[model samples]
Target: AAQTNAPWGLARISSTSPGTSTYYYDESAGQGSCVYVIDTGIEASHPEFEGRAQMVKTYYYSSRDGNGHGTHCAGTVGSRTYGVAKKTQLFGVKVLDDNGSGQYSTIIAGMDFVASDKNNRNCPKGVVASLSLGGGYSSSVNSAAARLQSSGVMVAVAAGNNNADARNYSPASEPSVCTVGASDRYDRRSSFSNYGSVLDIFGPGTSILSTWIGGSTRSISGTSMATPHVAGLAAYLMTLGKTTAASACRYIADTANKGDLSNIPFGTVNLLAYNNYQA
Candidate 1:
């Protein structure tokens, strides 16, 4: 049993083994799965990644995360010490630009490439695609995610940071995607998180610490941060032979903590993501 410092999100789900200080779920730290972040791009050379991160394709601009949001999200999804799936391979698909904005067509194009990528197409197991950015509802993007899910890709999207209802959003409200909402340490919904029946689960998003651009780490907030936790869980499940997208999504939702989300309206059914993979 190895004892190492674990992240708060991981700790919340059951960080340590019973009667021991060692971390649980260390054996299947996302070894056979890959998580593709569809966002601003990743640093690719961050030390926390130990060179496992890869730049699959860049949609609108260069393959670099100038805005730092993508890198931070990537870190949370899978990094050596700060992620749920510590050993999963990380891939960056840059759909948004430095200003954190991208055209709808470009976003769809990126998803197409991801769905057709050699890694995802050839791999026997499923890949988790995580998207943290969203705007007004876009049918094209939602359709793209649904297509990916049908093709054995596990998809996780943020339920927007806006305090309004998430049903008005596009990807979050889209069916067949794991829509994630933000929650604080107290297990209550974050002040700015969108809620409602569209949300598939709740995760820690406030003041999340993860890898950032420039080879450093930082703390950030938003539903963007929470989406990747579900993605990591999906990827972690893939390592355990849950290779089908539908099965992975079902397992993630089924095994979550349903009682933690008591404060939000109509939030009782969505599972609350926890770190204890063994449970």
Candidate 2:
């Protein structure tokens, strides 16, 4: 059966049914017009995604779809207009093979592709990338991320879902990259979301509903899920012509409910403010 109604804020904002008016529809939030997601390929035929979905690039790193994690993450960032930047072009780079496990090197390969694309002379609009996976922190990715920043490509990585400190992870923990942690619908950091001084911001990750490869849908969990929300938000921001990465990150964080941080481990991130800012 076709999903008749959906809550707003998947890959794009759903204005019709199931979802009420999403909070992220503000003017400052901008539009997520063109994006690149290096994850499991999206379900091209998903209701909200069919007409707008296009693969800018594709790569298979290790496995394919054994875990369904990549597809779910893809939906969070590009499930059509229901996603953060529903109108943005989506590029799928299958770095994680069929298995859920992917190495940092494979992920970097995908990043390289992002860098190369941005370097293209014919490229119309600059692109932003969402990476839902991470490895141990390394100055190397930080430097590489710097190169990406220099190239005008914004990359966001998950802060890991271990419910521990974010002192781990290579690129995410690195200040050069936008490190995203998880928060529940109430805008509180999930007990599972890792955080620290390095934490850049937070996104709606708890019980997120996204697409599956089998033409199915499910509500899932993890900072991986959260990563795409910010990805979508960032895409929307960039689409609206917000180019500065610092401004984009600050927009998401400043817009979150700041007073609510006393509840979670790293304190609450922000969602309400993000919506308000986007509006």
Candidate 3:
């Protein structure tokens, strides 16, 4: 067990054991990586963010986050309190709308922006885009993700909550992105997590606690919540020189804990996300 206030997803990824609750991590705290929160939007002023989070791009009429999904996921990826990579810079791409949904062009606009950000001279040590939304098959989205990966930004996407094969989803089924499924505290796949051959790995999703829109925290569940844990860990790995999307995915798979997860359906990789932080 750990301090009751610690976010369980953060705690789970830092330990190899199934039941341990402590979120032991490198003291450097991912100082050199930047994680882009590409979802609804973020409450940039949320106290949990400590001024590290900003809404850098918006496809909507305003830059504010009326829906809390992106803020929650951003908090999971890099809030000073609930973050996996505590010191990583956070950027909100703001693709999805207030209802937490968007079209292929909207998402691709966010993707293209990140891809373009790759050439910025002021860019951080590593760039990562954490996408917690998915829809039915869209070849356009897949191509956008591939182009983004080619730009050297690690992309982590949700496997969807349909309980169906991940292959049926858009960017989730895309080969170039790290498609993430959802797992519970007990090392079992969340019943809602999409699985099958395209799945890259699993991360904590059930009742994950993180920063909400009103400068508070809330516990929510979805593959939507799972992907950021992997993205945040990828940001941490990037700080260690796995700066490319391919290398980050490889390192994450290489260090993942195996056999601890159950209810992982056929074709879904059995590995659970880990941050490689030792006790």
Best by lDDT: 3
lDDT of each: 0.78, 0.62, 0.86
- lDDT for each residue of candidate 3 in 141-227, tens digit (9 for 90 to 100): 998888888788899999999999988898998998899999999889998999998888899999999999989889999998999
Arranged by TM-score, best first:
3, 1, 2
What residue pairs clash in candidate 1, if any at all? 13-275, 13-276, 14-276
Off by over 4 Å in 3: 1-5
User: What TM-score against the true fold does each predicted structure earn?
Assistant: 0.91, 0.80, 0.96
Model 1: how large is the Cα RMSD against the reference?
2.8
Ranking by lDDT: 3, 1, 2
Q: Per-residue CA lDDT of candidate 1, range 1-279, in tens?
A: 132565555555443221222335646778868888999999989998988788888976489889989998899888887777888888899999998999989888877777788354434555888897788887888898888777678889899999878878868878788888887666678888888878888877887888999989998889989999889878877877754677676777777776665468764354677544553
RMSD to the true structure for each prediction, in A, is 2.8, 4.7, 1.8
Write one digit per residue (lDDT tens) for candidate 2, span 149-255: 55667777788887767867666777766778776655567778888776787666778887776767788878878788887777766665644654566666665
